[PDB]
Amino acid sequence: MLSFQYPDVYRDETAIQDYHGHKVCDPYAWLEDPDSEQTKAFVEAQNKITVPFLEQCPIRGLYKERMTELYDYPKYSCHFKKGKRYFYFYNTGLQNQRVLYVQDSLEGEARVFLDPNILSDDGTVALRGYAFSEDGEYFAYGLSASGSDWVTIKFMKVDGAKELPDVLERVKFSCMAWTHDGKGMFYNAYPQQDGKSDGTETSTNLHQKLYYHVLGTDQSEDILCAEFPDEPKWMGGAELSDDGRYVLLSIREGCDPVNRLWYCDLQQESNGITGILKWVKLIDNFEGEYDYVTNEGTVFTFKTNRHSPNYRLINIDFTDPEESKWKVLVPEHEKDVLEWVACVRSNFLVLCYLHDVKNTLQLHDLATGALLKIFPLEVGSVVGYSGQKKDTEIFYQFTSFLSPGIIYHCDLTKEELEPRVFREVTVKGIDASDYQTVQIFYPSKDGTKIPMFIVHKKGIKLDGSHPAFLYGYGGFNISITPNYSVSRLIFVRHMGGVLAVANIRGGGEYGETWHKGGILANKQNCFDDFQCAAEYLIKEGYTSPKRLTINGGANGGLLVATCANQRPDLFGCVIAQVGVMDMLKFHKYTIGHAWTTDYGCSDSKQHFEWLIKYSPLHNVKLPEADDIQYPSMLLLTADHDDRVVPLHSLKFIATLQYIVGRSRKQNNPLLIHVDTKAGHGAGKPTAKVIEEVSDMFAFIARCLNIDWIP
């Protein structure tokens, strides 16, 4: 029979709530309290059955060993210049956290500048955001403990890497920007709250404020520069214009790519920064995004999606601000998304486009917007870039499914520009030439063509005999572009698998129209798109239902969990990482209120009607057909995940085990693993990353009985 027994989990049958006339029972609502002895006992009981299941078969050890070996390669970030020095991140291979290095010259010897590894035994203290003073002589950096979004900002004098006394607490979702006079720095902080603020609490985050910290003073002396007491969800991030004249405030409410844009000419302040600034409300609504690129006097260049879903560049003159007067510097492309733009060497613009989910990099003239040079790239993604207005060179990093990456360098003072390979590392053991990456477009239920990348060993027969790993996200205007993953390549090489990534709606692959096609009333399009990706892989012979594994994280966790409820017959295995499972209550915790722009909010009758149909927690149901059971499922979360509070996964697994786990026909396991000293994922130490992928693939291996291929 089964190899283990599911834990006893109390059902509060009195937990009933009325949603617009619809009665909803939430028997596991008590799991919403992370501090109770009841919840702690539940987590321990679940981990007690999951760990032995994952470690029983020797395949986990074989995988972990191969991952440790293959992932052990030098990892560099591209160089960036600040003041008179160069900086770059580098991990010898298996250090828990990458280290920040500094060199006084491009050819000079480098030395350790900031090593987060020495801040904890297990590498659970990580760098989260940083900002150098304009002259590059001072450095502010954020540290997060145990994977929490909470940040503590510390300071250092660059020359001699001297630690300073300045410490800023209660920082979260904060920008960091120094005024060019070198006096201090703008940052965001939240008011004091009852209970903990370490990542284990579920408390909603409201009333974020903008402060200014004068270097050499106590945080209690900080100046409040902006606040929105009547709009608790507004978040204002500050940045200084390239010439240091203006503070630009980008105010956001929710997750859509839109923002208010206010500015303050610092020279117009009566006596420096002493209180709420004299904000000029240039764009005082949430109808479009205005991303600062650079300015020349009062003429500001912004990347925008205002009446341009694929994005474009516009110049707004603060002295003649009306929309009818704006100049369109670089018009919107009919299909290619303008992902980001930077200004370098005074009058050059670096534009990065996404063409059929692949990146292109171009250099344009700032005055006219004319194309000047195309920087050639293979099929993949640009994941790093450096080069600000005063710089005379650029560095950019390229990655793809089969290559770790290449860091390029280009001296922009040269007449005939030509980038050169600055750094390149290959992984011995993974001969990229034994594999191939293809891109196909499959029709979804409504006929819309969806892109999908498929990576596999060359020459395989499309006889449906291969295990497959299909990944998706689908939301928040996030484009899922090619990236290097040793863990996935081990699945291909050592488990004979096929990798697939479906660029479903909700994402940003085809601009804001793509995004809107997967949100609110149309969120079901994401699930349909993904299910259709699975059907394609099956019909085309890459895999079969019992050999197919789907995976996603956060909004992607919601994706795969919903797909399991809707089409349990289509998948053999489902791994949902830190997923949003309770779609009726997500807005109640931490930063969840910001996601209503993609999902809607249950308080609304209309939204509730969309949400109730797909919410994973509210759609667990035994398959009607006797020959159909739920696929094997593994939920992965961590106790400091304050982005997507773990109660989502706790309640979902309790429900899966009770409604489906108790059925005689259910033989596939439904498990959860809650990690400690970890959170949503950012900053997770290498050691934990390796344990995680080892758990994932051991689960797939055991559930589908896959033999290891040495």
Partner: peptide, 7 residues
Amino acid sequence: XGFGPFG
């Protein structure tokens, strides 16, 4: 500072 359920 990316406050979405990104993963």
